[PDB]
Amino acid sequence: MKIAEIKELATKELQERLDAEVAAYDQMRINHAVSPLDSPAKLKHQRRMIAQMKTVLRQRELN
Amino acid sequence: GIIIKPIISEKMTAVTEKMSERYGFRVSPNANKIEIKKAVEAMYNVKVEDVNTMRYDGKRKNRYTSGLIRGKEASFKKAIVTLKKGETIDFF
RNA sequence: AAAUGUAGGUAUAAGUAACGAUAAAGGGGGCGAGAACCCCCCUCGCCGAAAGACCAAGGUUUCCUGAUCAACGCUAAUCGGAUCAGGGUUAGUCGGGGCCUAAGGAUAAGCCGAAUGGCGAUUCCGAUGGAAGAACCGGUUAAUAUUCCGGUACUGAUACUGCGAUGUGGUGACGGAGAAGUGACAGUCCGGCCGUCUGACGGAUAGGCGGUUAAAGGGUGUAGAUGUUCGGGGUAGGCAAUCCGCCCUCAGAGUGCAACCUGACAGUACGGGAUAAAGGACGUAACCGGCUCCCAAGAAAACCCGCUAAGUGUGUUACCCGUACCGUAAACCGACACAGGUGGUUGGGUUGAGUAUACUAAGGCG
RNA sequence: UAAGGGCAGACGGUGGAUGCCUAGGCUCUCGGAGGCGAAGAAGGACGUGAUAAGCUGCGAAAAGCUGCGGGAAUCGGCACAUACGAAUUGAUCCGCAGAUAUCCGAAUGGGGCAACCCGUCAGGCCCCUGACACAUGAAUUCAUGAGCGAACGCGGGGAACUGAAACAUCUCAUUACCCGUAGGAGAAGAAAACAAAAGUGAUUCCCUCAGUAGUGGCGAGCGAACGGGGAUUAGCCCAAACCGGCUUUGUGCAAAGUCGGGGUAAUAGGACUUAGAUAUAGGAGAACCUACUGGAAAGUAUGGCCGAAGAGCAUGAAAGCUGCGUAUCCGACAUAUCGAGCACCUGAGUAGCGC
Numbered sequence: 001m002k003i004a005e006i007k008e009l010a011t012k013e014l015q016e017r018l019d020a021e022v023a024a025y026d027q028m029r030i031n032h033a034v035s036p037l038d039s040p041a042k043l044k045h046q047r048r049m050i051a052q053m054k055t056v057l058r059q060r061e062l063n
Numbered sequence: 064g065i066i067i068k069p070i071i072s073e074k075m076t077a078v079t080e081k082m083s084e085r086y087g088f089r090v091s092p093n094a095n096k097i098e099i100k101k102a103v104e105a106m107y108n109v110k111v112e113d114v115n116t117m118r119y120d121g122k123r124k125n126r127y128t129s130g131l132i133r134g135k136e137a138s139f140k141k142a143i144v145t146l147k148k149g150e151t152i153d154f155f
Numbered sequence: 156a157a158a159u160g161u162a163g164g165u166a167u168a169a170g171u172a173a174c175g176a177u178a179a180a181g182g183g184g185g186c187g188a189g190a191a192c193c194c195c196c197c198u199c200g201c202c203g204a205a206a207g208a209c210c211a212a213g214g215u216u217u218c219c220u221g222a223u224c225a226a227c228g229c230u231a232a233u234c235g236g237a238u239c240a241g242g243g244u245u246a247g248u249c250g251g252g253g254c255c256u257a258a259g260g261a262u263a264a265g266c267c268g269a270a271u272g273g274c275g276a277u278u279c280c281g282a283u284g285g286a287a288g289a290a291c292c293g294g295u296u297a298a299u300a301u302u303c304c305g306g307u308a309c310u311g312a313u314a315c316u317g318c319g320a321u322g323u324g325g326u327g328a329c330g331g332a333g334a335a336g337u338g339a340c341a342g343u344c345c346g347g348c349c350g351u352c353u354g355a356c357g358g359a360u361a362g363g364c365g366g367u368u369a370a371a372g373g374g375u376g377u378a379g380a381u382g383u384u385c386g387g388g389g390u391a392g393g394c395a396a397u398c399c400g401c402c403c404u405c406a407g408a409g410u411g412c413a414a415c416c417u418g419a420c421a422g423u424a425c426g427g428g429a430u431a432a433a434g435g436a437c438g439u440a441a442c443c444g445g446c447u448c449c450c451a452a453g454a455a456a457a458c459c460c461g462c463u464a465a466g467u468g469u470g471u472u473a474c475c476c477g478u479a480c481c482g483u484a485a486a487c488c489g490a491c492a493c494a495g496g497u498g499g500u501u502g503g504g505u506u507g508a509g510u511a512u513a514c515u516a517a518g519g520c521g
Numbered sequence: 522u523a524a525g526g527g528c529a530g531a532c533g534g535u536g537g538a539u540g541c542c543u544a545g546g547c548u549c550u551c552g553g554a555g556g557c558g559a560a561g562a563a564g565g566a567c568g569u570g571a572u573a574a575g576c577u578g579c580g581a582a583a584a585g586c587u588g589c590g591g592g593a594a595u596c597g598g599c600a601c602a603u604a605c606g607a608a609u610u611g612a613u614c615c616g617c618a619g620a621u622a623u624c625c626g627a628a629u630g631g632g633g634c635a636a637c638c639c640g641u642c643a644g645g646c647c648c649c650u651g652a653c654a655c656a657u658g659a660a661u662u663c664a665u666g667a668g669c670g671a672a673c674g675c676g677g678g679g680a681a682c683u684g685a686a687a688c689a690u691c692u693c694a695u696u697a698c699c700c701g702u703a704g705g706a707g708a709a710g711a712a713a714a715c716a717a718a719a720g721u722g723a724u725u726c727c728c729u730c731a732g733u734a735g736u737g738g739c740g741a742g743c744g745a746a747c748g749g750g751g752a753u754u755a756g757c758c759c760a761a762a763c764c765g766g767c768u769u770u771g772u773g774c775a776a777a778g779u780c781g782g783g784g785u786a787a788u789a790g791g792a793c794u795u796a797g798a799u800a801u802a803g804g805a806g807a808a809c810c811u812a813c814u815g816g817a818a819a820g821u822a823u824g825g826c827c828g829a830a831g832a833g834c835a836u837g838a839a840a841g842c843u844g845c846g847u848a849u850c851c852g853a854c855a856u857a858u859c860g861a862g863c864a865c866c867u868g869a870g871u872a873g874c875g876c
């Protein structure tokens with residue numbers, strides 16, 4: 001994704017995408033260890049996107 | 064992040080070739096057996112029947128420069144998982 | 156230019172001392188550029204109450220495998236406890252820990268004291284001890300195995316088919332020495348059964364060789380042992396010390412012996428088979444937390460059972476840490492691959508009083 | 522003649538001196554500041570990468586996440602290679618404000634051999650696992666403290682070697698060192714003071730006075746003040762007499778306590794009769810050609826030009842005009858900082874005294 005499209009999501013849906021992102025991220029790491037992926041750069045991108053969702057969800061509650 | 068990676072080694076391939084329900088993963092060193100059974104069952108959607116564990120400290124890798132620059136690999140835990148008799152798992 | 160002056164480098168003695176127990180080596184093959192030393196085989200030799208096997212402390216990857224021989228190895232090295240990479244440690248019961256307390260330590264209320272602080276419970280911590288929760292035999296890997304697999308067991312929780320502590324009792328709960336009787340395992344001998352072979356020289360189809368196995372748990376109550384003996388405390392109670400009605404050890408504890416047992420090892424033959432491969436004679440404290448004698452008179456608390464005050468069946472399930480390897484040593488303490496030191500268990504056969512001594516198996520070494 | 526040896530030279534080996542150089546030190550000047558921590562510190566453990574020993578950064582959101590300001594083509598740390606990606610819809614990078622922030626450690630729920638083990642309580646999932654709270658001590662549930670860390674300050678304790686050419690008084694020294702506890706400074710500070718008929722008026726610090734007056738087994742030693750010249754300058758508040766109220770106590774009175782008024786001396790006195798600036802990112806910023814030597818000009822020789830810029834560093838040699846800069850000028854969304862009389866009062870186990 002990208003930061004602009006993440007904030008467009010509503011609060012109920014953002015948590016739905018979060019668990020989907022964490023679930024798919026563990027499979028990719030397992031998949032990468034079994035046999036290297038075509039694009040290793042998707043591991044960093046997925047991991048740093050999860051930190052973006054946790055940041056915005058925190059902002060909604062905190063602010 | 065319980066499961067780190069599966070184990071593909073000569074010993075484990077032979078173990079699976081005898082017990083078709085027997086698999087082995089690397090997991091976080093501080094996870095207990097109850098948690099590990101939950102993770103392997105919430106990700107591969109199977110019936111785990113038994114889990115055995117062992118803790119490995121990392122191998123020391125002492126290099127030399129002007130001497131004795133110590134190094135070490137991270138510690139890990141090994142989980143040997145037995146599925147319900149008649150179930151399998153595909154690492155591809 | 157000199158201080159038995161300091162650092163770094165390089166000489167001399169010198170191709171000299173020495174190469175770390177006088178247990179010992181010889182030959183044939185192999186890989187290889189290269190072999191006294193590495194691998195395989197035949198012979199020889201050493202240890203064998205150990206120089207074999209299993210733990211603890213300590214060490215911390217030295218364990219297994221591939222590649223490498225620069226450095227390390229008191230020689231060389233194709234080898235290594237060396238370098239690099241990969242791999243390898245699996246527990247409801249084992250050892251810890253979770254529970255309990257000892258020495259001691261830290262404290263509470265208090266006490267003492269220029270400061271820093273020193274003392275001080277029945278409190279807590281603290282094993283080298285106590286636990287009422289419980290497993291043993293076999294087999295498999297290059298490397299793990301009461302942990303994996305097989306067989307046969309056991310112990311907590313949990314779901315479905317009046318209770319009684321924080322007080323106070325009982326238990327737990329304890330020395331040294333001595334021998335005897337009963338009688339397993341191991342071991343030896345005799346004798347059958349199963350398989351296999353016919354061994355340089357004189358003799359032997361009568362012999363040689365390998366086998367013929369077993370634990371925990373369960374049962375019996377056998378050998379043997381011990382027992383015929385109305386006030387003093389724990390249960391009917393009020394905060395342990397001036398009472399009265401009530402059920403007993405007449406049975407306890409216990410080897411050996413059944414069963415577990417139609418497992419297993421070696422060797423032949425091809426996961427399966429021979430193979431469900433008789434029995435004796437000794438020997439034999441593993442009964443025994445027993446018995447007898449003595450004076451030096453032989454922990455604590457908890458678990459587990461009381462009392463009042465206050466108020467069977469089935470299924471599921473059993474978390475944590477250790478587990479490789481060395482360990483009378485080349486891996487621990489000694490600057491060393493050092494003739495030293497290092498707690499516990501086991502330790503076959505013949506000889507013997509013996510765990511002494513000599514020679515040997517398994518296993519380990521030159 | 523030379524098994525060998527001697528001396529000289531030539532060329533080498535070894536070793537790492539010397540010359541040249543710098544990436545790090547040393548001593549200071551000027552300005553600022555002088556703490557961090559229970560909202561969990563200093564210091565650590567363990568982790569964190571496509572790849573990942575070690576450092577660095579970071580904390581399960583883990584070489585990093587979100588805004589605002591800046592800036593403009595590269596970037597994914599030291600740091601390579603290979604591999605995959607990000608970015609002119611503005612990546613990386615810089616300034617500011619936020620988010621996250623495991624375990625130990627004052628460590629604070631109880632224990633403990635630091636980085637571990639074991640709980641009660643309320644919630645939610647399912648033998649386990651989340652996410653709260655739960656130390657002690659001094660004040661009134663609440664507020665506070667604890668610990669760490671340069672020097673300088675103030676307190677409590679306090680040596681010896683050494684000198685005296687021995688040594689005990691004395692010296693070293695109210696030092697070293699140990700302990701307690703502040704602040705940006707601290708301590709001191711507004712006369713029960715000095716002086717000597719002449720005067721100065723709080724404290725602190727510098728120059729003199731002065732190695733003087735003194736002190737001292739009158740030994741070794743120790744050692745002022747007054748006065749003068751400077752820096753800087755600053756002064757105030759209570760208690761009491763007496764009056765009022767209120768509470769308490771003894772018995773309307775009186776005493777104490779507590780707030781209000783009165784009052785503060787030395788010639789004695791008193792009562793009564795600021796919003797702009799600065800700091801932490803940034804923007805602009807002049808001016809050179811030909812020839813020779815050379816591997817390479819910035820050198821040398823001509824001829825130009827700029828200068829509020831001829832400081833410097835780098836660039837294949839020594840550059841005002843090649844680059845980064847320099848002189849000068851201009852800039853902040855944040856955040857940080859800047860009358861008579863009268864005798865009533867004027868501090869008590871205190872001044873003074875013996876040991």
Ligand SMILES: [K+]
Nearest residue numbers: 221222223234
């Ligand atoms: K090899």
Ligand SMILES: [K+]
Nearest residue numbers: 368419430432
């Ligand atoms: K048999």
Ligand SMILES: [K+]
Nearest residue numbers: 628630631632
């Ligand atoms: K604690």
Ligand SMILES: [K+]
Nearest residue numbers: 760779780781
């Ligand atoms: K007053």
Ligand SMILES: [Mg+2]
Nearest residue numbers: 113114115246
């Ligand atoms: Mg199991």
Ligand SMILES: [Mg+2]
Nearest residue numbers: 116117118246
């Ligand atoms: Mg384990």
Ligand SMILES: [Mg+2]
Nearest residue numbers: 157158159160
């Ligand atoms: Mg000498």
Ligand SMILES: [Mg+2]
Nearest residue numbers: 168169171172
């Ligand atoms: Mg000689």
Ligand SMILES: [Mg+2]
Nearest residue numbers: 169171172173
């Ligand atoms: Mg000689």
Ligand SMILES: [Mg+2]
Nearest residue numbers: 172173174175
């Ligand atoms: Mg010698």
Ligand SMILES: [Mg+2]
Nearest residue numbers: 171172173174
């Ligand atoms: Mg010799």
Ligand SMILES: [Mg+2]
Nearest residue numbers: 174175176229
């Ligand atoms: Mg030798």
Ligand SMILES: [Mg+2]
Nearest residue numbers: 205206207483
């Ligand atoms: Mg031995």
Ligand SMILES: [Mg+2]
Nearest residue numbers: 217218219236
């Ligand atoms: Mg080896």
Ligand SMILES: [Mg+2]
Nearest residue numbers: 228230231232
């Ligand atoms: Mg050699």
Ligand SMILES: [Mg+2]
Nearest residue numbers: 235236237238
């Ligand atoms: Mg090796």
